Every structure is written in C-alpha cells, then in structure tokens.
Amino acid sequence: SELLVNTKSGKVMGTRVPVLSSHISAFLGIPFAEPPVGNMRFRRPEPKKPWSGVWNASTYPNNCQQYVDEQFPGFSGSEMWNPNREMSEDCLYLNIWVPSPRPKSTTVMVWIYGGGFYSGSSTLDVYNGKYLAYTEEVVLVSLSYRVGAFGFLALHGSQEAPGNVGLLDQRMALQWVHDNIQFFGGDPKTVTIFGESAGGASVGMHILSPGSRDLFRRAILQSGSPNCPWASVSVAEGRRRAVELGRNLNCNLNSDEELIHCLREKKPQELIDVEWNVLPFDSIFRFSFVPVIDGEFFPTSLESMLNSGNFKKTQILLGVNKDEGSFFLLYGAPGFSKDSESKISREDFMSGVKLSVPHANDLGLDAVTLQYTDWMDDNNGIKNRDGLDDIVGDHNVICPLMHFVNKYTKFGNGTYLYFFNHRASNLVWPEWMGVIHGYEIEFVFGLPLVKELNYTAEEEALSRRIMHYWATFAKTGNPNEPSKWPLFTTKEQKFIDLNTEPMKVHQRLRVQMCVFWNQFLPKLLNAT
Amino acid sequence: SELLVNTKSGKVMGTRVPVLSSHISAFLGIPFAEPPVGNMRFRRPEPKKPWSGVWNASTYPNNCQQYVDEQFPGFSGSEMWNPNREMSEDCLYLNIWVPSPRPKSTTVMVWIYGGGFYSGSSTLDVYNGKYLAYTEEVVLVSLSYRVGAFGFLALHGSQEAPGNVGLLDQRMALQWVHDNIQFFGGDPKTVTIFGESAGGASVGMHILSPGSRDLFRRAILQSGSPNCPWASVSVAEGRRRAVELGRNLNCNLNSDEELIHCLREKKPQELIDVEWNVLPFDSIFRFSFVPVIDGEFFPTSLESMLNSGNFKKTQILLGVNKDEGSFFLLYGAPGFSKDSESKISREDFMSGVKLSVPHANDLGLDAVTLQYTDWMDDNNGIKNRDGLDDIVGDHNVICPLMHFVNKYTKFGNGTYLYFFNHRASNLVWPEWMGVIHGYEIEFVFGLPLVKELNYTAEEEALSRRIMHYWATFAKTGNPNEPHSQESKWPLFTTKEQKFIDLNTEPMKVHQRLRVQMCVFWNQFLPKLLNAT
Ligand SMILES: O/N=C/c1nc(CCCCNc2c3c(nc4ccccc24)CCCC3)ccc1O
Ligand SMILES: *[C@@H]1O[C@H](CO)[C@@H](O)[C@H](O)[C@H]1NC(C)=O
Ligand SMILES: *[C@@H]1O[C@H](CO)[C@@H](O)[C@H](O)[C@H]1NC(C)=O
Ligand SMILES: *[C@@H]1O[C@H](CO)[C@@H](O)[C@H](O)[C@H]1NC(C)=O
Ligand SMILES: *[C@@H]1O[C@H](CO)[C@@H](O)[C@H](O)[C@H]1NC(C)=O
Ligand SMILES: *[C@@H]1O[C@H](CO)[C@@H](O)[C@H](O)[C@H]1NC(C)=O
Ligand SMILES: *[P@](=O)(OCC)N(C)C
Ligand SMILES: *[P@](=O)(OCC)N(C)C
Ligand SMILES: [Cl-]
Ligand SMILES: [Cl-]
Ligand SMILES: [Cl-]
Ligand SMILES: [Cl-]
Ligand SMILES: [Cl-]
Ligand SMILES: [Cl-]
Ligand SMILES: [Cl-]
Ligand SMILES: [Cl-]
Ligand code: NA
C-alpha cells in the first residue's frame, strides 16, 4: 500500500490528504529520536529505538515547550506562529509529504522552522507541505528540534548539557532522512535543507559543521545566516546565562552537575516563565538560548571558518525580505504601535539605536546615528521610523547575510541571491511594517494557489514561480530551465527581486550600509 | 587740494586715477609702521615715525617677501595671484581709494588678502578698490601684513619672535585707519573689515582678539574663519617648526636668542626656500607659519572663546564658494591635472584622503572614505574626483565656517550667510575645478563692470548686486535696502539657518548648508579621534 511504508525503526501508516482537486500522501508525526525527557533533558538526542507495530502517523505531532506570544490575543497575524498543537518535551518528530502516485527516487526538501531558537513548530498552517510536494512533485519533509533552554542551554565542559543540542536534533532528523527517505520515494543523494530566520541560520550552520555536511546536498537560506549576531553566543556567555537562569529560579550554583539537576526537576513552563531574565543588555532584540561556538559542533570561530573555506562547497540560494526589522520594533521599541503609523520622534529614535545595537559604546552609537539620519529633516516621524527599521533589518539580517554570501561565494559551486519585496494583498499587519519577514513562506509553500485564501491572481502566479525556483534549485542546483535568474559572482554581485512584476537584476544588495555594518563599525568598536 | 591730506603721521600726496568714464582719488603705498627689517624681523610692528615733507602716495608699495607660485609660468590664472611689485621686508603699507568729490563721514571697508598666511599682496589687479569705492561711495582700504615665517614664526615666551606679528601688523594698520581715515572722509565709527581665505580667518581672529575688537564695527568673512584647521597652531607646534626651520638652516638651536640671531642674518629667500620643510606631514591645504594660540592675542582656545561668547558682538556677513578644494588638489594631489578632466582612480582617491586629513589614524580615514563614497560605483573617476574636492572643501573651509557661524550667531547681533556658486564665464581653469576659491573676489571688487575684461552682462549685474549687498551691509549692518522690492536676503538664525545663493539666476533661500558632512566634520570625526 502507498501509506504502508516500513522504516528502519518500525512501520508507519499515513493518510490520504486532499490537495487542489487531487490528493497526496502525508506521513505526520514520525519520531526520529527518543523523547528528550527527564535524565535526557538538555541532552544530545538519541535515535528512536525501533518499535513493533504500525505507527499511526496520521496527525501532526506535539510542539516543543516554548514561550507563547500573547501580545495580541486572538490576532490572526501573530497567532499563525503560535503552537497549534499541545506542547510537550516529547516533540522530536518529522512530517513527510509524498506525491501520489509514489515517486521513484525523487528530490527531497527538508524544511527547518525559525522563531529565534526560542519558538517554532513544524505544524503551522504556512508550513503545510501538501502544496509544494504536489505542485512541484517533490518529497517534502519538515522536521522539529527543541528550542529555548530545552534546546540550547550550554555549559561547555558538561556532557549532560553541552549546548547546540537542538542543532543535533535537526541533524538526527537529517540522518533519519538519509537513512529512511529512499522508502518514501525520496532520493537521499539529493536532500535540500531550507529554513527561514533561525531556520536560515541552522541551514548555514549545517553547511559549516562537519558533522552535518554529508546529510544534505544543497541549501536554501531565507532571511537567515549563521553569522547573524542573534544566532550564536560564545562559550562563556551561554554559561553565564545558564548559571543565571539557575539563580533566577534559585538553584544550586557551586558547579554544574547540581545546577543541571535543579533544572531537570523543574516543570517546562517554569524555565519559560523565567527564560528572558538572563539577557545581558536591555537590547530586547536578543534571545536567551541559542547555538554556542563550542569548538566541536563548530570547530572554530565562524569568520575563520568562512575565510578558511572550512564548510560544504555546494549550491546555495538565499535572500532577504525588504523589512526584516518591523516585527522586532513593534514588540519592543518606543512609539511603535500596530495601530498607528508609528511615526518616531527623534528621542525615541535615539533610544532605538541604543537598543538596536546592544553593545555599542557611545562612539559606536553616534556612528550608527549619523549613517541613518537625514539632518535636513531629522524630526520627520516617518523617516525616523523607517530609518530605525532599516537599522534593525540591516544590522540583524541583511548585512550579516551579505557578509555570508560574499565569503561563501569565493568557495562554493554556485550562489543565487533574491530580494523579496512584495507585500501580500491580504496582510493583516499595518502598512508601515512593509514586507515583514516570514511572509515569503506563504509563497514558498504555495498558499496563494488556494482560492478561498483570497490571494490575487498575480500572487498565485508569483507563488508558482518561487516554488519552481526553489524546487528546480533543489533538483538541479539552479532555479532555471533552459527568463533566467543570474548567478551571483564574487566580482559582480547580482541578485533579483521577487515580486508580482517581471524579474529584474540589480547588483550589490544594500552595499552602502553593509560596508558600514561589515567593515567600518566592527573596526570602530574594536578600536574603542 | 583733494589729493593733499594732512594726517597724524605726516602729509600724503595722492593721485587722481580714472574709473568707468569718471575719476576717483587714490592714496597708494602709505606707510603705517616702521619697516620690519634688521633686528626688527619677527618682532611686533612699531608705528611709522612721523615724517616731514609730503609723502608721495601715488604708486603701489612693495609686497612682503613670500613664496612665488611657478607651477604654470605665464598662466594668468595662477600668476594673477603672484606678487606684481618688488618684494621686500619693507612692505607694511596700505592703500586708500576715496570718492571724488570727497565724502564727509562715509563707510570704510578694509580688505585683508588671503594667501594661506604664506603669501598675498595688497596690490593685485583683482583687489583694485577703484570700482568699489566708486560705485558704492565707500572709502576702500587694502592693507598688508608679513606672511610666512616673517609674519608668524613663533617662539612663545620670547619677545623677539612672539608669533602673530603678522596679525599685529593688520591691527596697527587698523589702528592707523581709526586715527586718520577721518582725514579722507571716512567714518572711523563705521569701518567694515573683510577678507578672503586666510584674509577671512584674520577677520574672524579680530572678532575674537580683545585688543582688536574696538578698531572696526562690522565684519565680513569669505571662504575663511578663525577656527579652520590650517589657520592656527599651538605654542608647542609653532616652536618645533621655528626650531626645525633653523635646523634646516644649520642654526644654533641651544636657545631662542641664538636661534633668532641666526635666523635674522639669513636672507629672505633662504627662509622661503625651506619654509615647507617644517611641515609635520605630507599635506595639501597646510602651511608652515600661521597664527598661534599664545594666550595674548588669543586669551584662550578659539573654541572656548566661541562658547563663552568671548568675542565682538556685531553683524557678520560671511560665506563660501562651491569648490573650495579644487585649487589645492591641482597643486598637491595625485591624478589632478590642469589640462585634463582629472578622473581619480580609487588608489589616487585613498591617497588624497590621507593628504587631506594628515592628522587622522586609519579609523579616521576609513570614516572619511566611507562617507564620501558611492559603493554602488566606487571606481567612477568623476565621482571620485568630485568627492575628493568636496572632502577638501568641507574639511578645510565649509564646515569650519559653518561651525563658526553657528557659535557666533548665538551671541552676535545678526548673521547673513551666502553660498557663492557662479563659475565666471571667462575662467582660465578647467571645468572640473568648478567655482574656484578666490573667484568670488572679482565680483566683490566689481571688475565685471569693465568692458574689456569680457564678462557676461549678467556677470556685471551680479557683481553690482554683490557690491551693493556688501557696501549696504558695511553702512547699515544689513545687506538689504528697506523700502526696496528686490527679494530679501534673510537672516541666518540660530536655527532656521536660512542662507542664500549668489549667482546670475534669481535669489533662492535655502536652509542648513551641507549639514550632513558638517555634522560629520564638526561633530563626529573629532569625537572619533579623541577616542583613538
Ligand atoms: O521584544 N520584546 C519585548 C518585550 N515583551 C514582553 C512581553 C512579556 C514577556 C515576553 N518576552 C520577550 C522578551 C524579549 N523579547 C521578546 C521577543 C518576542 C517575544 C517575546 C519577548 C526581550 C526582553 C525580555 C522579554 C516583555 C518585555 C519585553 O521587552
Ligand atoms: C489514527 O488516529 C486518527 C486520529 O485520531 C484516527 O482518525 C484514525 O482512525 C487512527 N487510525 C488507526 C489505524 O487507529
Ligand atoms: C562547479 O564544479 C564543476 C566541477 O567541479 C566545475 O566544472 C564548474 O565550473 C563549477 N561551477 C561553478 C558555478 O562554480
Ligand atoms: C611720485 O613718484 C612717481 C614715480 O616714482 C613720479 O612719477 C611722480 O611724479 C611722483 N610724484 C611727486 C609728487 O613727486
Ligand atoms: C540687535 O540689538 C538690538 C539692540 O540690542 C536688538 O533690538 C535687536 O533685536 C538685535 N538683533 C539681533 C539680530 O540680534
Ligand atoms: C575681449 O573680447 C574682445 C572681442 O570683442 C577681444 O578683442 C579682446 O582681446 C578680449 N580681451 C580679453 C582681455 O580677453
Ligand atoms: P527569526 O527566527 O524570526 C523569529 C521572530 N530570527 C530573526 C530571530
Ligand atoms: P587661503 O589664503 O587661500 C590662498 C592659498 N587659505 C584657505 C589657505
Ligand atoms: Cl485545499
Ligand atoms: Cl535527576
Ligand atoms: Cl566535506
Ligand atoms: Cl511589488
Ligand atoms: Cl565588495
Ligand atoms: Cl577703467
Ligand atoms: Cl630652543
Ligand atoms: Cl538667533
Ligand atoms: Na631658551
């Protein structure tokens, strides 16, 4: 039977899922690792011990314990990212969509959700692979990995909580696909990992980490980059945040073994309730527990790994949305409201800049202030709003990623750069937020193809172009079939807009500010 | 007679000269101080001892000893600024144009030439006061001061070479105008000083100097201001040059007295021949002997004086030209050529930034580079040549002056600020150079009214509206005439910072002149360098 497939851990049985007047096969909630519970919290994952019987794989799994956003109770635009299934620590499962009839050895794409390494679910509506699998005839996997202290508490020197363990869940799911995707009609020799935001950063980190290079073939990074400043901490820092989260729930502190004992006895929400109390700078724009540069998941510093070319040389397709900064000001800045136009007074703008660059000494702030101000019109509420929004976008995503693509492209076997700047016709957030990050995913997964979702014709049209770009890249290493998307070369730096209009080529994405972010400001703060 | 005038120092015979189908009275080469020669080299001027007989004031004086520009021999564009009379340390004289018939109690304007404090003459074709004195009915004076080492060699603590004696020359010439201009129909209560470049910076230095504030009434500063980076040095730095100038001359340096004795025996050109060797850096737009922050002529720092309000309160009219920097890149920067459009490669651009900001660490020059570059297009010669020109103009003239206008306006009794952007139709310098610094001056002095100098008719009009704006400012403290219906030049206020264009098309009123780079030059980079 199509939905009777026997894996190396036991058999699973799926479900026939409708999709656009046809059907595909879904295998939902397959366990790829033993539940990380009790003695095994904070621990490296261990693979799912094989089970007797048929696994009812017909409903989405649980979601990992995570902070739940209630800034806007019942607002669809923020609830679409909250967990939609019960939260459990028993949350390491993956989901597979397989075209019907079952293909023989075909391209698999594995989706890695973002949400800042504090949140995220495989089971959102926007991550529903039934459309991308069907329309592009690929096998689609979405994995899961633990987030928060459950996934990234780091006490280097300890093997009970070493850190990066949630990156290891993703690799174990990746290993599971490498071991079991042949049976679902997948081609293990052509796996394509892709994810957005913290998903983007994970895809980049598996390109970097030697333990992950051979478990996938190429990579798509949307609005995310392994060198982003919010994506890693040093070893010492991830310790002090573990140490203090201990003290912020009154734990034993003279060592590790006792501080970790004290944290496996606490209930899940207990740490989530105190999650954020460990952030060094007011900052607002950081996340408590994130990957650590431990010296073994990552052998060295990332910059040295990219100058040295110590990563996978393959094909990458990557890009950003126009306004990566909107979401983070709205939730944590002065004068940003989801109901006004959020025009920003100068002094509120000054506040943003100090929040926006956690670390900067006084001189580093005056640098950033001068580079985003128009001093013929510095009390213009709008371009003060738009200026600080750019600061966050430029510093936290766009320029961290251009740095990555520039260093990567010296060594890789191909690079494709996009700039996503279409605001969806049915977006529920205010216009001043522009092309909010995360809202390219709707198109990647072909939701505008669903007529009841009230997208336009040109957005259905735009979606299919993107899924084909993504799918053809996943099958061939290049999104085109012999109008053509140019390769990004070390010397000409071309990229493309993605929107409802005919494709157009530009060079040097936001170079003026990314010179400032990647070269000048680093040298200012190291000086003083 | 109209031409025999009996002063407090003796009688002077002048000459009746013509101008514009009429005639004016001129008094040329009148001495205002003892010849700073012999053992009086490097010392303060002493007032001219009064003479018997009638001083023949009919011909132009000598020019002070100075370097002579000879990059382009024969080339009028550069030789028009070279001395046109014999050079001599005997050079402290001054010239007066007086309307005819002679006025009763009329406005006096006193010109101070620029030349980087290393050069300049009162006697250059472009500083002929005959047209200005004539068409505005003001009494025009140009003075003189010793330039280079002779004027500004400064061994602070010594009384034999104190520094600033070049500035003190101009003060004693103004003291002379205070005491005698009335004998020529000039109101010593309504004297306007003005000058260009280093002449503008001196005007500003007399606004600051206590011993100078009472010898004029209003002020005018063109493409110069006291606080500019090339206009002052500290006591310590002026000393190490003075010493080093002696080292270059194999002098005894064990003591000032010995070092000044040694320096006073050498011939003028022998100093002039080494005066550049004392510069601390490969520089463009820097000169060896300049005023010093001594604690007498300047009680404290130019900055603290500007902040405490320790200066003369009046009306200043002041401004700059567009391409203040293009002269100095031509003579001192790589890739620039007089007979070429001078597209600057990135390599030559980087080199120019170091020559323009001699004093900065590399964090400094990365800052300057990052902020004058288009990175979408970093190897476009025109954008690079033009960017370097703006760097030099902004760092050295535009932004130091907009700092000054800002500080002064807090306390002054009125400020009028202009941006002069007319490339004269007959300029002999290539187009890339734009509106070269200095080339406002022929409009201020009304040479476009002379027909065989071949100006656009609308260049005559522009030269007449300016002279008017300037003499009207000198008379009343306001460039405008009330009653009139010509469009009005607004006051620069502490902030709505209005200023005007100066060209052949009608007057536009702009605000906040080059804020962005002047926030960079006046506020950010100084901070970066104090931390680094
Ligand atoms: O930007 N947030 C702004 C923000 N919100 C809240 C809402 C309640 C707890 C959410 N706890 C979050 C925290 C932070 N960042 C978050 C980002 C997204 C969702 C929740 C966050 C950083 C500072 C500490 C807590 C409190 C304080 C804040 O300062
Ligand atoms: C598996 O679970 C779903 C959801 O509860 C149920 O509808 C389905 O019948 C189950 N299948 C089997 C074989 O028990
Ligand atoms: C990729 O590698 C192949 C073989 O190693 C080489 O021939 C080809 O030119 C490379 N292409 C790019 C775009 O780097
Ligand atoms: C003044 O000097 C000039 C030349 O030196 C001479 O021609 C002129 O006659 C002199 N004037 C008088 C009054 O002697
Ligand atoms: C100048 O001073 C007079 C008298 O003190 C005053 O009335 C006038 O407002 C002042 N103007 C400016 C521009 O300072
Ligand atoms: C001015 O123009 C006339 C042409 O009418 C010419 O004869 C004369 O030589 C020109 N003079 C100068 C100084 O250029
Ligand atoms: P990404 O995971 O976005 C989630 C809010 N990242 C930019 C942190
Ligand atoms: P100025 O006197 O220009 C003549 C060389 N000064 C700006 C140096
Ligand atoms: Cl459907
Ligand atoms: Cl235990
Ligand atoms: Cl490898
Ligand atoms: Cl669009
Ligand atoms: Cl580059
Ligand atoms: Cl004439
Ligand atoms: Cl000495
Ligand atoms: Cl004011
Ligand atoms: Na001595």
Domains and CATH numbers, chain B: 1-532 (3.40.50.1820)
The first and second tokens of residue B21, run together, are 């189908």
Chain B interface mutation, best of A353, A362, A365, A366, highest count of B Cβ atoms under 10 Å? A366
Contact A468, A132 (CB under 8 A): no
Chain A contact present for B495, CB below 8 A: no
Question: Tokens at residue B387, please?
Answer: 């960017």
Residue nearest to atom 5 of ligand 8 (CA): B115
What's the order of all strands across the beta sheet hosting B11-13?
B4-6, B11-13, B54-56
Question: What is the residue whose two structure tokens read 């187009």?
Answer: B431
Tell me which H or E stretch contains A76.
helix A76-79
Which residue of chain A has the CA closest to B371? A371
3-class state of residue B422 by DSSP: coil
Measured in Å, residue B315 CA sits from the centre of ligand 5 at 10
User: With a 6 A CB cut-off, is A201 part of the ligand 7 pocket?
Assistant: no
DSSP per-residue string spanning B168-218:
HHHHHHHHHHHHHGGGGTEEEEEEEEEEETHHHHHHHHHHH-GGGGGG-SE
- B70 CB-contact burial (10 Å; exposed 0-12 / middle 13-18 / buried 19+): exposed
φ/ψ bin of A246: left (φ > 0), alpha (ψ from -120 to 50), beta (otherwise): alpha
Q: What is the DSSP string of A105-140?
A: SEEEEEEE--STTT---TT-STT-THHHHHHHT-EE
Using alpha carbons, select from A331, A29, A291 the residue that is nearest to residue A163. Answer: A291
The ligand 8 atom nearest the CA atom of B285: 8
User: Helices (DSSP H) in B342-483: which residue ranges?
Assistant: 346-356, 362-372, 381-393, 399-411, 441-444, 457-476
Nearest CA in chain B to A512: B375
Strand pairing category for A106-112 and A139-142: parallel
Test A512 with B367 for CB contact under 8 angstroms: no
C-to-N gaps above 2.5 Å in chain A, after residues: 482
> b/e map of B319-336 (b: 16 or more CB within 10 Å)?
bbbbbbbbbbbbebbebb
Locate B485 and state its tokens: 């219906």
Instruction: Give the Cα separation of B29 and B121 in Å (integer).
Output: 12
Q: Nearest CA to A504 among A482, A483, A479? A: A483
User: For A226-284, where are the E strands, in sequence order?
Assistant: none
- Which helix (H) or strand (E) segment is A464 a member of? helix A457-476
The answer to whether the CB atoms of A527 and B366 lie below 8 A apart is no
Contact at 8 Å (CB) between B334 and B352?
yes
DSSP state of A394: I
Resolution in A: 2.8
The experimental method is: X-ray
Q: Which residues of A are catalytic?
A: 197, 324, 437
The answer to whether B220 and B316 are in contact (CB under 8 A) is yes
Other C-beta atoms within 10 Å of B375: how many?
Answer: 14
Q: Taking a C-beta distance cutoff of 8 angstroms, is the pair A248, A149 a contact?
A: no
d(CA B229, CA B231): 6
The alpha helices in B80-162, defined as continuous H runs, are 130-136, 148-152
Peptide bond into A101 cis (omega under 30): yes
Name all contacts of A267-271 with Cβ < 8 Å and 24+ positions apart: A268/A65, A268/A87, A268/A89, A268/A150, A269/A65, A271/A148, A271/A149, A271/A150, A271/A245
Nearest to A325 by CA among A251, A397, A389: A389
- Residues near B457 by beta carbon (within 8 Å), at least 6 away in sequence: none
For chain A, give the number of residues.
528
Pairing of strands A93-99, A22-31: antiparallel
Residue to mutate, B30, B56, B86, ligand 4, most ligand atoms under 8 Å from C-beta:
B56
Query: Which residues does chain B have within 8 Å of residue A507's beta carbon, measured at their own beta carbons?
Result: 376
For residue B325, give the DSSP letter: T
Distance CA A215, CA B268 (A): 83
Q: Which of B376-413 are b and which e, b meaning 16 or more Cβ less than 10 Å from the residue's Cβ? A: eebeebebbbbbbbbbbbbbbbbbbbbbbbbbbbeebe
Residue A197 Cβ < 6 Å to ligand 7:
yes
Query: What distance in Å separates the CA atoms of residue B322 and residue B331, rounded to the nearest whole number?
Result: 18
Residue A377: count other Cβ atoms within 10 Å of its Cβ: 12
For chain B, how long is the longest CA-to-CA vector? Answer: 73
Protein residue with least CA distance to atom 7, ligand 5: B413
Q: Are strands B415-420 and A505-507 parallel, antiparallel or unpaired?
A: unpaired
Q: How many CB atoms lie within 10 A of CB B2?
A: 11
* Secondary element (H or E) of residue B93: strand B93-98
H-assigned helices in B39-154: 76-79, 130-136, 148-152
Yes or no, beta carbons of A363 and B511 under 8 Å apart: no
Decide if A457 touches B, using CB distance below 8 A: no
- Which of A375, A511, A512 is the closest to B515 by Cβ? A375
Do B184 and B155 contact (CB within 8 A), yes or no?
no
Q: Which one of B372, B378, B518, B528 makes the best mutation probe of the A interface by having the most chain A beta carbons within 10 Å?
A: B528
CB atoms within 10 A of CB A86: 9
HSE value, Cβ hemisphere, 13 Å, CA-based, for B455:
21
Nearest residue to A273 via CA among A100, A487, A70, A96: A70
How far is ligand 4, taken at its centre, from the CA of residue B34, in Å? Answer: 22
* Residue of chain A minimizing CA distance to B374: A512
Pocket test for ligand 8, best of B71, B112, B121, B197 (most atoms within 8 A of CB): B197
Q: Please state the φ and ψ torsions of residue A390, each to the nearest 5 degrees.
A: -65, -40
* Chain-centroid distance, C-alpha B158: 27
- DSSP alpha helices (H): ranges in B115-164? 130-136, 148-152
The amino acid sitting at B427 is L
The alpha-carbon gap from B407 to the nearest alpha carbon of chain A, in Å, equals: 18
B532 neighbourhood in chain A, CB within 8 Å? 527-528
Closest CA to B530 of B361, B366, B407, B412: B361
Query: What is the distance, to the nearest Å, from the Cα of residue A456 to the centroid of all Cα atoms in its chain?
Result: 27
B29 neighbors B59 (Cβ within 8 angstroms) = yes
Ligand with smallest separation from the Cα of B447: 14
What is residue A465's three-state secondary structure? helix
Report how far ligand 13's centroid is from the alpha carbon of A407 (Å).
10
Give the integer Cα–Cα distance in Å for A495 and A508: 8
